[PDB]
Amino acid sequence: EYSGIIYVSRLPHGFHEKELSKYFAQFGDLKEVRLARNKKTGNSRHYGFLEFVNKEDAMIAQESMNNYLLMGHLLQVRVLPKGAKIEKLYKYKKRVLVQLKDNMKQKHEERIKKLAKS
Amino acid sequence: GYVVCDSDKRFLLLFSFLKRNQKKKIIVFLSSCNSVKYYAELLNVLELHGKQKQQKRTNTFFEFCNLICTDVAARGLDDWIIQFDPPDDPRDYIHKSLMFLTPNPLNEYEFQSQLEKLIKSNYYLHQTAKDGYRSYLQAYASHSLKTVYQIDKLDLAKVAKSYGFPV
Amino acid sequence: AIPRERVIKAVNELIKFTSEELKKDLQLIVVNNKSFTGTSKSFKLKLLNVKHSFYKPWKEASATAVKDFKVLLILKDSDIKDDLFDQLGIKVDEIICGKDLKTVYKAYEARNAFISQFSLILADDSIVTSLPKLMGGKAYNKVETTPISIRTHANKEFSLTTLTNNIKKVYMNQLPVKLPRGTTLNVHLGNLEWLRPEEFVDNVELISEQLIKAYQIRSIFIKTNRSPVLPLYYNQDVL
Amino acid sequence: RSQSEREEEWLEKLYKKHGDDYKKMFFDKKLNIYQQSEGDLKRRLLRWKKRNG
Amino acid sequence: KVPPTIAQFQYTLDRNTAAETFKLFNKYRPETAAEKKERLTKEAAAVAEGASPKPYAVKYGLNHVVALIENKKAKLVLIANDVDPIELVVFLPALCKKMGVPYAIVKGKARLGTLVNQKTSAVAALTEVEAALAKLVSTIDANFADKYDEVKKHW
Amino acid sequence: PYEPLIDWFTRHEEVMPLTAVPEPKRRFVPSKNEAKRVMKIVRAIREGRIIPPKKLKEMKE
Amino acid sequence: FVRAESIVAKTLATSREKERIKRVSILEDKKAKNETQHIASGKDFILKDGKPALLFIVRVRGPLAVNIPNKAFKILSLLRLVETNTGVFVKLTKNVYPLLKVIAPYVVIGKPSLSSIRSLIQKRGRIIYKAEPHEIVLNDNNIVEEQLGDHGIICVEDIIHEIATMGESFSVCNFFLQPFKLNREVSGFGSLNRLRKIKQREAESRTRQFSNAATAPVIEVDIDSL
RNA sequence: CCUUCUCAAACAUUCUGUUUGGUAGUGAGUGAUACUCUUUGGAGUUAACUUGAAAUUGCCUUAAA
């Protein structure tokens, strides 16, 4: 059996979650959509996961878009067996729009003593 | 010692080894006399083989005494002594010295799109390239080597001789 | 003046210690700083004046070494109009325009291969600002793969003499360096073969003086790739 | 027989560029667009010189 | 009943991949008679008063297209389904598969020829291209050559 | 009546091309068959029976 | 149903438009503060200032089907130029100057002429008022004499003078004019219209170009084209 | 199926030298020792290298009909 989760790697650049939800909503009532975004930067990894409320539609969508040649690169859409849910995919964001002399002297002395190790 | 070198990067390895000196007498032995004629034009050491004029060959060798030679012509005429193409005899070379092979004694060592563009653009360097490639192929097939026979695919041999499509 | 005694000691101690390719040969100087450019990451390549034309030995070693680098000059549409090189002791390798880089290199593999070919990345100041959107991360992920800025325009028009004199000066004076938003900065120098001790001390003196003048540097250490951090100057008085 | 006007001008340009160095003319992609061999080059250049000294 | 060797056509490339292939081929349309004539006239006028990179164009003629095939010079082969003499194209997919060259089938010989000026072209091929050719070849493979590799079966 | 075919031959791929025809110079030369037409047009222009393209635009009265 | 390519293209275009708008707004905010210390430029220029000048603006179609963005959509709603091929006269000012860049990609601006303004006013005009859905044209000056004329704008010639001379009643008349819906260029389809549209589209790229630079000079073209 | 910020200012003017500003990037993944800060939370920085736009889970409609 195939689970409702759909694995699609090789996603086009800029193919955010909103576009995936909008396009897959045509096929029916999709459950959830998530994308693997890097913590350091919001740029995605070009691979994400999404789930459908119906397992039949889940594989129907993969069959229809199995090797569809979208702009940039084709979609590597695959369907996993029962289980393998969409657990844990966070929507990382960049950010909101926008005494000492003693330690330094000690470190300098330590470096001056250590340089003799050469 | 012998050096393991894949045919896909044989040209790159040879170019690096040549660039490692730029002057010292890096003696190299080639199985095919036609191949050296094609390799001489790839420097864009001097040509020294038996197929060319004997007088000019001798004069060039005398000048160099102050290379690019085949197995047969190197015998008796004489930093690194190397053999790239398969030897004319498996043991005549063993009798500094280093070897290159990858179909299968002392030790072993450890560790270019312009040519591809030009091969299809220059007619003469294309005819010479294919001539050398298939002369090396004939030498490899005609040689009764102990453990080397017709098995290796030419898909990498063509690349080794700068050729893209299989001739 | 910077302490020349420490430099004289280092030019012998470090040479003995080092005497793998970049670790043994690649000379560099590291300058400690107290933050930079606030909350911004402008990719401006700062230039430092060098008393010696270290580019000539750099290309001499590269010519005699396996790694042969190429100089790429990014130009504009008007610049297409061998005159761009006939007036240059120094020879430019390749000249390309931004028109091609934005489309003919859509394949990231080809873009990476093209970038790795060159090391002295030169570009017109007018088009330098638009480069990062084209060459991608890999070019800006290494100091030697990012575009350097050279002034070629004169009276808002192309000038062959302006390009020639500026490129000659850069080849016999300027040295690039990045501007990270951090407390550490690196300025590559050259190879172990570069000049002799006293000449090397003179070479480092101007670099250190310019670094001190340009900004309130914190400390500078004489260094070599993965070598011990030999102290040079202690500029804690600013703190 | 003689060389054509355009052919004569091309041969004169090649001779000025290289003189009698047919080997250099062979690799002269700027003028040797057809990749003339070392023999044809000299065969045409001798006839060109016959009328030019 | 059609034999297994026949009916390999009619089952052809999908809509999106076919459109992408047509768009890619349109980028290398051969110079037409009028354009070639005007270019030659301009060249003559320039030379008559006061040396170019090798051109690129799609291959369409059956004889020379097959000549490029077998020599491994054909990077991609596109074949029409509605060709009247089927025997002209029955062996072409087999030859392409034997030589290890990507191949594809399309519906409508006239649409095949519309991208090469001629009224009809039966088959078409490409010799040189920029980088989308590899992606198109992979898509064609995964959608026709590997998904329908069982063409030898059925009747 | 209804049996599948056998791909006994369409399972291995040839390496070397079936023929070793020598490479003709024309493939490496700029279309001498086209230089012929260029020179024919040059001759026609010299004879004056063919109008230069510029005069075509200059005479669109 | 809609194919995937359209959604991806719309998203890519929207991202670029939003980035350009944000960059332009951020640069203009710093320019207004007069700091002008770490920005590309502080001055303004036009090539082919914020001084007063009456200009004509035409709403052009394109770029690609970008979802209505808040800033540009609101700016257009202020001028009520949502419909394509619609134009209206606006008084150029330093405060209004950044609006050009804000809505530059969607509109084309230039300096009109007295003859062009007179012809446009006398050939087209709307008065959407007394149910009051009627699009009555400026048939007679009686409406101008009654509803207008409080400030002395009694006839169409007075409106022309106010528009060209930037009179006090310029705001009142401009709102009353219900800016004109200019006819589209080709205005057809079929055998000849397809080729005519294709031929005309080439000039659009060479005329309606956006450099997307934050300090890009104001795009200006002669209104004599139409 | 879509094209990326291809110069803004001052001295001086020698067919233009000097000075400043303007460059927020595809990710995946390896990695040779140091900088501080920041007050236990880890935050940014210093060489070099692989990549098929490869990849499995970090809390306004005449681009219409």
Numbering used by the authors:
A (entry chain o): 88 to 185, 195 to 214
B (entry chain D): 267 to 310, 316 to 337, 343 to 354, 359 to 375, 389 to 397, 411 to 417, 426 to 481
C (entry chain K): 31 to 49, 72 to 133, 138 to 144, 148 to 298
D (entry chain v): 175 to 227
E (entry chain G): 70 to 119, 125 to 203, 208 to 233
F (entry chain m): 239 to 299
G (entry chain t): 55 to 102, 136 to 217, 222 to 317
What text does the study give?
To further decipher mechanisms of such an intrinsic quality control pathway we analysed here the contribution of three yeast large ribosomal subunit r-proteins rpL2 (uL2), rpL25 (uL23) and rpL34 (eL34) for intermediate nuclear subunit folding steps. Nog1 is part of a range of intermediate nuclear to early cytoplasmic LSU precursor populations and its association with LSU precursors was previously found to be independent of the ongoing expression of rpL2, rpL25 or rpL34. Structure models obtained from single particle cryo-electron microscopy analyses provided evidence for specific and hierarchic effects on the stable positioning and remodelling of large ribosomal subunit domains. The structural analyses performed here provide evidence for strong and specific effects on the yeast LSU precursor folding pathway upon blockage of the assembly of three different LSU r-proteins.
Expression shut down of LSU rRNA domain I and III binder rpL25 led to similar effects on the pre-LSU folding pathway. Again, two major folding states, Nog1TAP_L25-A and Nog1TAP_L25-B, were detected in Nog1-TAP samples purified from cells where expression of rpL25 was shut down (see S4 Movie for an animated overview). Both were, again, characterized by the absence of clear densities for LSU rRNA domains III, IV and V and the 5S rRNA and their associated proteins including rpL25. Hence, their overall fold again closely resembled the one of the low-populated Nog1TAP-F state of the control sample. Only minor displacements of rpL25 main contact sites in LSU rRNA domain I (helices 9 and 10) were observed when compared with states of the control sample showing clear rpL25 densities. The factor and r-protein composition of state Nog1TAP_L25-B largely resembled the one observed in state Nog1TAP-F. On the other hand, in state Nog1TAP_L25-A several factors binding to LSU rRNA domains I and II and the ES7 element could not be detected (Ebp2, Brx1, Rpf1, Nsa1, Rrp1, Mak16) (compare Figures K and L in S1 Appendix). In summary these structural studies indicated that both rpL25 and rpL34 have a crucial role for the stable positioning of LSU rRNA domain III in nuclear LSU precursors. That effect is likely still increased in the subpopulations of misassembled particles for which numerous factors were not anymore detectable (Nog1TAP_L2-B, Nog1TAP_L25-A, Nog1TAP-L34B, see S1 Appendix, compare also with mutant LSU precursor populations depleted of factors in). These populations might represent newly made subunits with limited access to these factors, possibly through a delay of their release from accumulating misassembled particles.
